[PDB]
Amino acid sequence: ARNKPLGKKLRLAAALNSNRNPPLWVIAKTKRRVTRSPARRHWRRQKLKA
Template sequence: MAARKHSGRKIRLLKKTRQNSAVPAWIILKTKRKVRSNPQRRQWRKTDVEVG
């Protein structure tokens, strides 16, 4: 990927990176394991990110 990205694209990529994280352990404990997985989880090779 190009090193020079416009700031809007960079912000959108950062948001997608944050969304791709796992559910924190304290939330799993708090919800008594009802919430265990992140449905927005994405594998970088398999799904494309439409950020422009």
Template sequence: MSRSKPSGVKRRLARALKENSAVPAWVILKTNGKFRFNPKKRNWRRNDLKV
């Protein structure tokens, strides 16, 4: 990947990076395990971003 990216691409990559996190433990406890998994979880090798 190139070092210098357009700002739009950089913004979308940053958003994808933030989305790619697990659900916090306190959220799982607060919702009694109803929200346990993040459906937007993504692996960098398996899934490709449409940036």
């Protein structure tokens, strides 16, 4: 929406900050054991209930 309340906006900000895979050096550090993040999502598929 165009007209957002700040509280909702800050929950959207948190989801934006967490939506990313582990860095490449983490994959190296863990010998490829850690390659995915549970916070990884796509805006079209996994919907936030914000």
